[PDB]
Amino acid sequence: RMENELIVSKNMQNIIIAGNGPSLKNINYKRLPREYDVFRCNQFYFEDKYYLGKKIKAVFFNPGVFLQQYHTAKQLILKNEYEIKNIFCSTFNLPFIESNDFLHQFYNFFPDAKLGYEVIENLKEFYAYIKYNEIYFNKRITSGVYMCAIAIALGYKTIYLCGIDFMSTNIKTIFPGINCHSKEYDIEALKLLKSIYKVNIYALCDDSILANHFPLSININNNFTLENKHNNSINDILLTDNTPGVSFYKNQLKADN
Amino acid sequence: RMENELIVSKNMQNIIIAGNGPSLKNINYKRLPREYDVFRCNQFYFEDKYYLGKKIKAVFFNPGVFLQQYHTAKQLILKNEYEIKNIFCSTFNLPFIESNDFLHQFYNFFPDAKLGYEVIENLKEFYAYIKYNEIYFNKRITSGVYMCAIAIALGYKTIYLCGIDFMSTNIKTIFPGINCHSKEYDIEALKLLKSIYKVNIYALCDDSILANHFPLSININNNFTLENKHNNSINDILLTDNTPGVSFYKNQLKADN
Amino acid sequence: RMENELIVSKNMQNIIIAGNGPSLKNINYKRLPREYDVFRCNQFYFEDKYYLGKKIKAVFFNPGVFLQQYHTAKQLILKNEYEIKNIFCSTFNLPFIESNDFLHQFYNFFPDAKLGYEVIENLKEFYAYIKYNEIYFNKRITSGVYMCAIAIALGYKTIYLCGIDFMSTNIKTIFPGINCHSKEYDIEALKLLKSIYKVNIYALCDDSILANHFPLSININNNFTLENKHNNSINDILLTDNTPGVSFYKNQLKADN
Amino acid sequence: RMENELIVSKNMQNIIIAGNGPSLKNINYKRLPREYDVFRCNQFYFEDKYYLGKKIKAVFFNPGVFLQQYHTAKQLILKNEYEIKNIFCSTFNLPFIESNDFLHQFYNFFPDAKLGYEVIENLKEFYAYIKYNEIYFNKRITSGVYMCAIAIALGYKTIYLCGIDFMSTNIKTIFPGINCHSKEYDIEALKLLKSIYKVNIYALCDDSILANHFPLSININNNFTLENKHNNSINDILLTDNTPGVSFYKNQLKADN
C-alpha cells in the first residue's frame, strides 16, 4: 500500500514542507519548482482547499495523538481524499517526551508507520544540538523544522517552506481540559541545518514573517490548479472506538504522563 | 526431529488448509491436487478419521492453550498418530492479545516451535491491514485465514480450503468457567490475500458456505484412502502435570489476563 | 589469560568427562587415549590427588553457587593448582531455573566466563528434548551429561566417562539450612546424544554401574603419573567477602528464589 | 562537530594522559614527544593555565556528575576555552556502579558521547582482571589508569603520564552533604597493561611519586608555551537548570542510589 522506505533519487531532490499557519493559503504558486514531493503535518486535512494538492509524500504526527491521527490518515486514504506514501511519528527518543512503552510498542501497533528519530539521528551534529538545547534549555523545534531535518536526512537538497508562521472540537473531547518553542530557535535551527548539510531553503509566501529570514523562491511563472475540498471532507481529527486494543493503548498512555 | 525452517520448493507450491468445521468430513477427495502439503490447526486430532492423512507439514495453536497443545502434539508424534514437521503459535504481536512475558519467554519454553507473527509480518500490506482492523474495529481473522496468510508468506501459490464453516471436557477442566470473528471479515481478508499476493484459493467441500465464495477445485478424479483413527487415539487436549516448570508457566499466564 | 572460544581441531576430538563420584579414584588409566582434553565440574578440586592431571580444558559450575565457584577457580589458577582454559555456567535458559537478572547480568559480572545454554542450544533436537522433559516431566540431566552435550556441540567425537556414579562445610555456611535427576534419564539422554550426533561414548572405570551401560574403553596399556595434591590445596569452595559488589549480587539472588 | 569514532593512525601513537594532581603544574615539558594527543579527565578545566594546551583529544567524566560535566564541556567548547574531540563517560558496566537506567538511557541523553566500557571491554584479559578485583576485593582503578586502558584499547602504544599523584563549591551545591582506590592497585594495573598489551609508559614529572615506578621520559629538549587561562574562564563544574529534561534525569538518578 504505502512505501517501505522513502528513497530520494538524485534526479528529484525538491521538497515542499508546509505547516498549518495562515500563510498556507497565501502560497505564491509561481515560485514552486516544476518537480517536488510534499510533506504535511498534524491537522493538515483541516484545510478547506488542496493548497498543495492531494499527493503527500509523507505526513508527520505527534506521539500524543498518534493513535487518532494514524486512524485519521488511513481514512483519508480510504476515502480518496489524499494519497499518503509515508506516515511518520515526530519523535526525539527522549524518555521525558516519549514513554518507553510508547516507543517500544510503536511498531507493534503501527507496523507500516515510521519513528522519525531513527531518521534524524543520522544528522549526528544536528541531533546532538537539538537534544542539548531540549534537555538543558527547554528549547524544542516545531514540526516544520522537524520535517526539514527529516527531509535533509533523507536526501532532499532544496527546501521550500510555507504555512510556517509565528476544528479542535474533537481534540477537546479527546483531551478534556485546557513555552519550549520560539521563532528564534526555529530560525537558528533552520540556519544550522543549512550550513551543516549544505542545502537550500526558500520561502514561498510573500507576506510571511518567514520571508524576512529566508529568500523567497524565484517567480518562474509556475501555475497551480487550486482544488476545493469536497463537502463531506474529513476536517477534524477522528475519534476512536473503545475496542479492547484502543482501551489498552489509552489506558497505558494515560498511566505514562 | 522436526524442521528448522519450513521451505517451499517452486516445484510443489500446493497447500491444503483445513479448519475443524463439519465440512472436514465432506471433502471431495477427487478435487485434491496430486501433490500437496497439509496445515492443521487447534483440536484437529479430535477427528475420528484421518480425513487428510497422517502427515502434517505444520500445525497451528493459539497462545492461550499453547502449553497443553505443544505437549499434545509431542505425544501425537511419539505415539505415531501423526507426523508433524512444524508447530506454530498463531500470533499477531499485539500486547493486548499476547503478553510480553509470553512472547519474550516463548522460545525459552518451546525451542523448536515457531511464532507465527514473525512469518506473517512479511506480508507488509496484509499485516498492516489486519492490525488496523483488530485495533480500531475489533475484527480478527480466524485460524484458517491465519494459516492461509502463513502459507502465502512461506511461498505456497495455490490454496485448497476445507473445514472452514460459519471433546472440550479437558478444556473445561483447563478453564473452570464459561465477537471479533465474522464470516464477512474472513472472506474479505481471504480475497485481499488473493489480490495482493497473486495466489489461487479453491474450496474442496461441495456443500459448504465457503464454496459460494471460492471456486470448488476441479474434479480431476483424484482418489483417497480414508483411514480410521485407532481405538485409543488421543481425542482431547492433554492435561499437564503441576511440575515446577508448568506451575511457573501457568502462574505467570494467570497473572497476565 | 583463558580462551575466548573453545575450538576443537579435527586432529584431536577426544574428551575426558569426569563427575565427582567414587569411580573417579578407580579410573583404569590404561584405557585412556593418548591424546585428550579434560572437562571437570562442580567441586572437582575437593579431589585429594590429580586423578586427571592439572590441565583442565573447561570447568562447569551451577548458577546457584557460580559466584563462589568463579572465585574459587580464579584462585585455583593463581595458586598454580590447576590450569583452566574455560569456565562454563551449566544453564538451560529456563526462567524457573535461572532468574532473568542472573542471565542478563551474567557477563557483566563474569566477562570471561561462558553460559552453557548458548552452546547446547545448537543441538536443536537434543535441546528440545531436555526442555520438554524438564518442563512437563520434571526430569533434568546431571552435570556429567550436561558436559557430554557441551563436548558434542563443540566438536568432540569420542567421549570417555569417569566419576559418574548413581567438604560441604563452606557450603553449609553459604546455605544455612538443609528428585529431577535419575540414573535412567541420564543413560537415556546419553544414548540419545550418541544416536543423534554420531559420537562414541566409553566408560573408564571397570567396577562402575556406568560400565554396565557403556563399553569400557580398550586397554591400550596407557600409563599415568598420579600426582598427589599439595598440603594446603584448596579443598573446599571459597567464601566471598561482603564487598559492595558481592552484597549487591547476593541480595539480588536471594530475592529471586 | 566532534569525532564519531576516535581512530589512532600507526603514524602517531603517542598519548599524553593527565590527572589533576599537583604534578600537573610540574610537568617537564622537555620530556614530551614532538607528536601526541591529550586525554584529560574530571575537573581538568579548574586548571589556571593551559598546562597541556587547548586541544584535547578526549575528556573523561564519571557517571555521577556526567549530566553537569557534559554540559560544562559543551560550554568549554562554545566559549572557545578548549577544543574537545571526544567525550567519554568512565564506566565498567557493573550494576552496583552504574544503574541500568543510566546505561540504557545514556545515548538517548548524550548522543555524541561515548560509554568507556564498550572500549575497554575489548582488553579481555585486563577487563576480567579489574572486574574480579572490583567485585570480590573492592579495588577500583582511578581515572588516570582508566584512561590508559582506553588509550591502549584504542591503539596508542606509548603513554606519558602527569598529574597522577597519591572549586568543589558548585559540587557542594550539587551534592548537599559530605577506599577502593590505592597507589598500589593503580601501579599494579598499570604494570599489567604494560606487560599484556606491550606498550610503553613514561612519567613526565621529575618530582612525582609516579616517577619512582615508571621511567621519566627522555629530555629531548622539547619546548612548550605555557598559556595562562583567561579571567572569566570556567573554573568550576557548571550547574544545570531545572528544565523538564534535567528534573526527569535527576529524579531518576536519585532513585537509583
Coordinates of N, CA and C in Angstrom, one line a residue, chain C residues 1 4 67 70-71 74-75 108-110 112 243 245-246 248, chain D residues 93-96 124-125 127-128 131-132 134-138:
Chain C
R1 N 44.4 -14.4 29.1 CA 44.6 -15.4 30.1 C 44.0 -16.8 29.7
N4 N 39.1 -17.4 24.5 CA 38.0 -16.6 24.1 C 36.9 -17.6 23.6
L67 N 28.9 -17.6 41.8 CA 29.7 -16.5 42.3 C 30.9 -17.1 43.1
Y70 N 33.3 -19.3 40.7 CA 34.1 -18.5 39.8 C 35.3 -18.0 40.6
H71 N 35.1 -17.5 41.8 CA 36.2 -17.0 42.6 C 37.1 -18.1 43.0
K74 N 39.4 -18.9 40.0 CA 40.4 -17.9 39.8 C 41.6 -18.2 40.7
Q75 N 41.3 -18.5 41.9 CA 42.3 -18.8 42.9 C 43.0 -20.1 42.7
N108 N 28.1 -9.3 32.8 CA 28.6 -8.1 33.4 C 29.4 -8.4 34.6
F109 N 29.1 -9.5 35.3 CA 29.9 -9.9 36.5 C 31.0 -10.9 36.1
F110 N 30.8 -11.7 35.1 CA 31.8 -12.7 34.7 C 32.1 -12.6 33.2
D112 N 34.7 -13.1 31.3 CA 35.5 -14.2 30.6 C 34.9 -15.6 30.8
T243 N 31.8 -7.4 50.0 CA 32.1 -6.2 49.3 C 30.8 -5.6 48.8
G245 N 30.0 -5.1 45.7 CA 29.6 -5.9 44.5 C 29.0 -7.3 44.9
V246 N 29.6 -8.0 45.9 CA 29.1 -9.2 46.4 C 27.8 -9.1 47.1
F248 N 25.6 -6.8 46.6 CA 24.6 -6.4 45.6 C 24.2 -7.7 44.9
Chain D
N93 N 30.3 -1.0 33.4 CA 29.2 -1.9 33.1 C 29.0 -2.9 34.2
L94 N 28.8 -2.4 35.5 CA 28.6 -3.2 36.7 C 27.4 -2.5 37.3
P95 N 26.3 -3.3 37.5 CA 25.0 -2.8 38.1 C 25.1 -2.1 39.4
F96 N 26.1 -2.4 40.2 CA 26.3 -1.7 41.5 C 27.1 -0.4 41.4
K124 N 40.2 -7.9 26.9 CA 39.6 -9.1 27.5 C 40.3 -9.5 28.8
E125 N 41.6 -9.7 28.8 CA 42.3 -10.1 30.0 C 42.3 -9.1 31.1
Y127 N 40.2 -6.5 31.4 CA 38.8 -6.3 31.7 C 38.3 -7.3 32.8
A128 N 38.6 -8.6 32.6 CA 38.3 -9.6 33.5 C 39.0 -9.4 34.8
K131 N 37.4 -6.4 36.9 CA 36.1 -6.8 37.4 C 36.2 -7.8 38.5
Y132 N 37.2 -8.7 38.5 CA 37.4 -9.6 39.5 C 37.8 -8.9 40.8
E134 N 37.4 -5.6 41.5 CA 36.3 -4.8 41.9 C 35.3 -5.6 42.7
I135 N 34.7 -6.5 42.1 CA 33.6 -7.3 42.7 C 34.0 -8.1 43.9
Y136 N 35.1 -8.8 43.9 CA 35.5 -9.7 45.0 C 36.4 -9.0 46.1
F137 N 37.1 -7.9 45.7 CA 38.0 -7.3 46.6 C 37.8 -5.8 46.8
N138 N 36.8 -5.2 46.2 CA 36.6 -3.8 46.3 C 37.8 -2.9 45.9

